[PDB]
């Protein structure tokens, strides 16, 4: 709302964000190969390569739908696909992850909004906890509810800032592009995000 | 001018789909190799697959960081040379680079790297791809020369560059020639194509 990125700058920052998120697991694959060649712990090295490749794959498949155009011809996305890539993604994240709600075809940007709200939620519990998703409403008027609980509970400051309609203090970059993008998707989809924060939990909801 | 236009949301989505696709493939190959290694019977083959795919994934990641990502205002062509050289080590054509190392506006260097992908696309059975950097730092000129057994300007690039709208919408494949042209437009540079029976020269200035 208060700031806008050019097509070139949005695309570049989203690409940087995806790259940033896979540097470590792809690096660990290379580390595993180095350990394997050094010998003495071949099983550990292979296990590392396996889990790091699974991590990289999960992040790429999630990005394919949350940031990319995948799962769509376009126009619609199957929330069953969204549930699958989200569940595998959170296998490599701290919170205990649950998903509730009927499998449904929805406009692509509404499902992309949903997946991006998971990332905001994850950011709100940086010391872990639980992230629970509920799909509610109708297929014409969906409602997404993302509820997080954990020892550290805080609305991500950049998201709070942008969502309140305030221009950012520093330029949008590969970190802040994701909350910017989340709000952009909500605007595009004609949906409004609400934040309800208590001492027990934070609920991010959209409708 | 480009005969089609993408919204910020659609360009962002298609660029992300393209890099996801290009790095998913070798990561997927590692996973196939891991399944095969666990089965035994071709351990050497499975390990060679894992190793070659890890190098592909790393090379594509580092190239994407600069060619597609935002990695401030200027880019050092030395960094472009480094990621391009490693990328093409894992590709068919013989790759060479000539020209003074220079700091240039980021989109001009992104244009350069994206022109390499078009060049690579023009020689699908291999050959040589040669880069020359010319001109001044205010008026750079890029020259990409390809030679090979098969020479063909990638049809989607030819179509878009010639000003004809495509019969089908831009997708995760054709977004790359679209982006190449879009970068040239923002940078105020013009791409010319000189295709003969002997070689194809893509130049920008
Ligand atoms: Na995983």
Curated annotation (Swiss-Prot), chain B:
UniProt keyword annotations, A-Z: Cytoplasm, Kinase, Phosphoprotein, Transferase
Consequence when changing residue 35 to R: 10-fold decrease in phosphoryl transfer from CckA-P to ChpT
Protein name per its UniProtKB record: Protein phosphotransferase ChpT
Coiled-coil stretches: none
Family matches, as NCBIfam families: HisPtaseChptBrucRhz
EC assignment: 2.7.99.-
Top EC group: transferase
Disruption of the gene: reported phenotype: This gene cannot be deleted or disrupted in the absence of a complementary copy expressed in trans, indicating this gene is essential in B.abortus.
Phylogenetic lineage: Bacteria, Pseudomonadati, Pseudomonadota, Alphaproteobacteria, Hyphomicrobiales
């Amino acid at each position: 709302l208060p700031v806008t990125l050019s097509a070139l700058d949005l695309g570049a920052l989203l690409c940087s964000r995806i790259c940033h998120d896979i540097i470590s697991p792809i690096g660990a694959i290379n580390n595993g190969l180095e350990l394997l060649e050094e010998g003495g712990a071949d099983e550990d090295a292979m296990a590392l390569i396996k889990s790091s490749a699974r991590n990289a794959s999960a992040r790429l498949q999630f990005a394919r739908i949350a940031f990319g155009a995948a799962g769509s011809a376009g126009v619609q996305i199957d929330t069953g696909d969204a549930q699958n890539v989200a569940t595998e993604y959170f296998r490599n994240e701290k919170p205990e992850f649950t998903w509730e709600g009927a499998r449904v075809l929805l406009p692509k940007n509404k499902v992309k909004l949903l997946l991006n709200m998971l990332l905001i939620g994850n950011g709100a519990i940086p010391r872990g906890g639980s992230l629970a998703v509920r799909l509610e409403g109708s297929d014409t008027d969906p409602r997404f509810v993302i509820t997080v609980k954990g020892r550290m509970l805080r609305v991500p400051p950049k998201f709070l800032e942008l969502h309140s309609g305030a221009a950012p203090e520093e330029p949008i970059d590969a970190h802040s592009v994701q909350p910017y993008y989340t709000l952009l998707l909500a605007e595009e989809a004609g949906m409004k995000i609400s934040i309800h924060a208590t001492a027990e939990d934070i609920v991010f909801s959209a409708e």
